[PDB]
Structure formats: C-alpha cells, structure tokens
C-alpha cells in the first residue's frame, strides 16, 4: 500500500508511486525522473495517465514501452492545469529529465516535492522565489554532516586531467567508464571531448542516450566500438576481471586500461581530498572511484531549506528506520532555530 509521503493531500495525485497497483483515489501519477527506484512498477501494461518531463516521456515510450496515450509530458518553468490544479515542473539538477514539482492547492496551500535533486543556489532564482511554500517533500539522501563531496566541476576537472595525462603518455591506453542508469553523462562526455573521440557503447545504451535531448549528441556517441577510445560498460563489469576480459575483445588495439567508477558518496570523503585520490591497480589496469554526486551534499541541502523556510518538511529518503527519522528531525529543528523561521 502506498505510503503517505508519496501522496499529495487535497488532490488525486501521487508522486513516484507505480509499484502499489491501483492507488485508491489517484487520478494522475507523477514521475519525477527515470530511475528504477522511482519508476518501479511501470511497464507497457500501465493504463493510467502519467505526468512527467519530455525526456522522462521519451524514455517511458522507448525503453519501458508505455503506450503513448498515457504519457503526458509537460514543459518546465510553465504554469499548467492538471485535473483542475495548477502545477509547475522545475529542473531538479539530478539526471536528465529530472524535475521538482510545485503544486498550488485549491485551498491556497503551496507544496514543493523535490523528487531527487542536487540543491543549488540557482534554484533561489527560479519560480520558487515568487511565493511561499508551506510543505516540502525533500530528498534527504545525504542529510547528515559527514556527507561532504566536491562540486561536479572539480570532479570533472580531475577526470579530464587524469585521462588526458594517461593517454598522452600512452596512446595505446583505453579509457572505460562504468554506467547503470541515466545521470552522470558529463563524466564520459568530458573525457571523450578532451581525447578527441566519440564515446562507444552498446546498442541498448546508445538508445537510452538518444532519448535525452542532448545537443549535438550524434557528434558525441557511437555504437562502433572500434573507432572509439572511450568505451562505456555496465558498472558491474568495472573490476579487474571484467576489464581484462574487455581488453581481450579489443584485438591488440590497446595494452592498458584506465577506468572510472562514478559512485555516490564514499567514507574516503571524510579524509581524502579529490586532488589526492589514487586508483586501484593490477598490472596494466587502473580503476578510479570518483565522487560525482547528483544529490545534495548536507551543506547544499541545509542552505536550500534555510532559504525556502518551509512550514513543514516531509522526508522521502531514509524513512525506514526510527534512528534515521529521528536524526533528520533534529537537523530540521537546528536549521529552523538557526535561521529564525
Ligand atoms: Ni534518482
């Protein structure tokens, strides 16, 4: 049965609630973005209206085969009426197509559901600045102060310079980047760009990237592995076994692999700086884990909430334990007392 934090009171709306069968009273199912924990339950046999971004809609049609008549894409930054309720989709600074949703309730309550997001000061000059928000359904993934990580810009700088250096030393080195869902495309596109190559990948992954409205994408990616010196592989294949087996398949074109594993946060973040990160190495294979996050750090989350000053906060992540729930409520109270709302 659908949990309360996926229901929008005063509406027939749910968010990211596709795995509970038919939700009693729900006239429209919103999908924030195309990640499996969020879309879980959707398939080509789903027969209720889905509201989402254009990019999320392209992926529902082409990857899950949801029929077109049930896909309702909405433009961003635009006031739209859905079943008699005004809504706005805003960019969530998560993966492609990911949105936050503002719901303007008939009784005058305003609700922001962040979906999955990485809070940014630029959101303080979106349509959010224009009115008050009473309830906030918040992505609390990293809501604890030990969760620090660098900016996306710094991480990409590290990766570009690492890759460029390795391949200029050895023109016979192959770069491999791990992937399992959309998001974090910047990692492999920046590296390929600095090396003057397209990114090579499977037909299934190429299809996925073709849904994302990335400008000039046809110039950046290919299914011809032979012509490319940046390859994508499934994340599970980024280990010494998987990589050796992949190097065998390239037919003596390369004698070295440098591989990147974009992770979320990892405990090495409490000690080590990004400058200082080193790979794991076995023979002619090196593997960097890099902390490229598409979720708020603690400090980014704190800033956004203190700026927004919501009257009530409802967490959407880490809700399954009493210890987590209790930890989160403590930080919300701190933030509220520090800022005076
Ligand atoms: Ni996500």
From Swiss-Prot:
Chain's gene name: DCLRE1A
Subcellular location as annotated: Nucleus
Record's note on what induces expression: During mitosis. The mRNA encoding this protein contains an internal ribosome entry site (IRES) in its 5'-UTR. This 5'-UTR generally suppresses translation while specifically promoting expression during mitosis, when cap-dependent translation may be impaired.
Location of this fragment in the whole protein: 700 to 1040 of 1040
Signal sequence, renumbered to the chain: none
Protein known as: DNA cross-link repair 1A protein
Subunit record text: Binds constitutively to TP53BP1. Binds CDC27, which is itself a component of the anaphase promoting complex (APC). Binds PIAS1.
Top-rank lineage group of the source organism: Eukaryota
Function: May be required for DNA interstrand cross-link repair. Also required for checkpoint mediated cell cycle arrest in early prophase in response to mitotic spindle poisons. Possesses beta-lactamase activity, catalyzing the hydrolysis of penicillin G and nitrocefin. Exhibits no activity towards other beta-lactam antibiotic classes including cephalosporins (cefotaxime) and carbapenems (imipenem).
Tissue expression profile of the protein: Expressed in brain, heart, kidney, liver, pancreas, placenta and skeletal muscle.
UniProt record similarity statement: Belongs to the DNA repair metallo-beta-lactamase (DRMBL) family.
């Amino acid at each position: 049965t659908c949990p309360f934090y996926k229901k929008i009171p005063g509406t027939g709306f749910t968010v990211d609630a596709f795995q509970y069968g038919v939700v009693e009273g729900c006239t429209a199912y919103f999908l924030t973005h195309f990640h499996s924990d969020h879309y879980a339950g959707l398939s080509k046999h789903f027969t209720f209206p889905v509201y989402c971004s254009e990019i999320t809609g392209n992926l529902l049609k082409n990857k899950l085969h949801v029929q077109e008549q049930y896909i309702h894409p909405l433009p961003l930054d635009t006031e739209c009426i859905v079943n008699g309720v005004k809504v706005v989709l805003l960019d969530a600074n998560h993966c492609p197509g990911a949105v936050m949703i503002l719901f303007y309730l008939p009784n005058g309550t305003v609700i922001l559901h962040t979906g999955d997001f990485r809070a940014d000061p630029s959101m303080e000059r979106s349509l959010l600045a224009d009115q008050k928000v009473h309830m906030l359904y918040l992505d609390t993934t990293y809501c604890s102060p030990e969760y620090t990580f660098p900016s996306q810009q710094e991480v990409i700088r590290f990766a570009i310079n690492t890759a460029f250096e390795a391949v200029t030393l050895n023109p016979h080195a192959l770069v491999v980047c791990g992937t399992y869902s959309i998001g974090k495309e910047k990692v492999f596109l920046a590296i390929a760009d600095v090396l003057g190559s397209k990114v090579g990948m499977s037909q299934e992954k190429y299809k996925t990237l073709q849904c994302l409205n990335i400008p000039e994408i046809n110039s950046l990616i290919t299914t011809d592995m032979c012509s490319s010196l940046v390859h994508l592989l499934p994340m599970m294949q980024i280990n010494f076994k998987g990589l050796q087996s992949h190097l065998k398949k390239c037919g003596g074109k390369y004698n070295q692999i440098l591989a990147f594993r974009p992770t979320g946060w990892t405990h090495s973040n409490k000690f080590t700086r990004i400058a200082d990160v080193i790979p794991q190495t076995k023979g002619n294979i090196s593997i960097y884990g890099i902390p490229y996050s598409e979720h708020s750090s603690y400090l980014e989350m704190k800033r956004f909430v203190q700026w927004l000053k919501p009257q009530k906060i409802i967490p959407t992540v880490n809700v399954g334990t009493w210890k987590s729930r209790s930890t989160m409520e403590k930080y919300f109270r701190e933030w509220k007392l520090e800022a005076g709302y």
